[PDB]
Design a protein around this nucleic acid. Structure first.
Length: 17
RNA sequence: GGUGUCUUGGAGUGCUGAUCGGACACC
């Protein structure tokens, strides 16, 4: 069902928190 | 809030995108 909602493309977390 | 789609530097330890949350059209 929730396929595109959960699965994400490319985005790096530059150690935010 | 749900369904389809996309989100960002929206969150998020994933060895960096799974899971979650909103918007948009429809309900």
């Amino acid at each position: 069902t929730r396929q595109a909602r959960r699965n994400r493309r490319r985005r790096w977390r530059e150690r935010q928190r």
